[PDB]
């Protein structure tokens, strides 16, 4: 386990942690359209 | 009207984002190792 | 040394990274909020 | 060399966290917009 | 009248998919050491 | 009487700010490579 190596792998990690953020703004993404088609599609024709 | 329910989206976002804590714990872990 | 330098670029990085898992714990609570008045505040008041 | 292939990669990681930094960005400007539409359309109608 | 907020949803699939570049090139230089 | 996240939004964007200071340190220590 060199130097190297250990910061090699200390990047993959850090490149998994920002997947894993990637993922979850996809899903934030999902979460306001959500919302902005309830508004248009049950508010909005009520009221 | 039966509400707004986004918890599925909400809650799977908040998996993601522990899973995403636990990978920099590790590199931070590993930086440690330096 | 080149080893301490990107190991210290690299926990840079790393905050920059918690930096922004803060900001969308923070981003699910604004939806989480706006979700919470249209389903307690505005679809009662339609309701009504 | 290993030390420039890791600068390297890290430097790409960095424009990959900078690409995020954009979208947190703009989904503010997303949920702004929702609120000012309920804010302002919706809760004055109601 | 309804809530478009596509131009700006759009435009973070775009940089998503740039982020997601970005992470290959550097994962495809680690896997060369 | 209606919804008030301007608050956390602006927090959001704190935090943002301190994210990109945070890459722009790491690219200056990358810089002195």
């Known amino acids: ?47 | 009207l039966d509400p707004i329910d986004i918890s599925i989206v909400l809650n799977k976002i908040k998996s993601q984002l522990e899973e995403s804590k636990e990978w920099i714990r590790r590199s931070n872990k590993i930086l440690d190792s330096i």
């Open chain 1, 1 to 47: 386990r060199s130097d190297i190596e250990k910061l090699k792998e200390a990047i993959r990690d850090t490149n998994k942690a920002v997947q894993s953020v990637q993922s979850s703004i996809g899903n934030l993404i999902v979460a306001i359209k959500s919302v902005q088609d309830y508004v248009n599609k049950e508010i909005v024709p009520s009221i």
